[PDB]
Amino acid sequence: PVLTQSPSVSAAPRQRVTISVSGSNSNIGSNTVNWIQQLPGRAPELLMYDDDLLAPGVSDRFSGSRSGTSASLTISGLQSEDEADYYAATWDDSLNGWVFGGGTKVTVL
């Protein structure tokens, strides 16, 4: 994985969890970030795209942002159904293809 993500994050219900990712100039620095959600046992789906825009059908509780070589995913009002692995994705101009984060697991309580 060319993008650096923390392996896991935990929080209580209704709390705000922020999943960060940091890349470089050729990827996150000049291209827009996508977020991919994969629920336990389920196929992965598009969560967020173009840094801050929600995919069709996604909960409004998700928000996104990107500055410099970094980006972040923000889940608000953390619910049990958000318990999943989240992946940062963006284009890399140096590798001429898609690059991905390792993934951040979310665990609720």
């Binding site: 991919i36 992965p44 994705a89 963006t90 898609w98």
Partner: peptide, 14 residues
Amino acid sequence: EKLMKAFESLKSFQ
């Protein structure tokens, strides 16, 4: 084409 390109990144991912 932002949304489409984003679906193509999922296709590449999975």
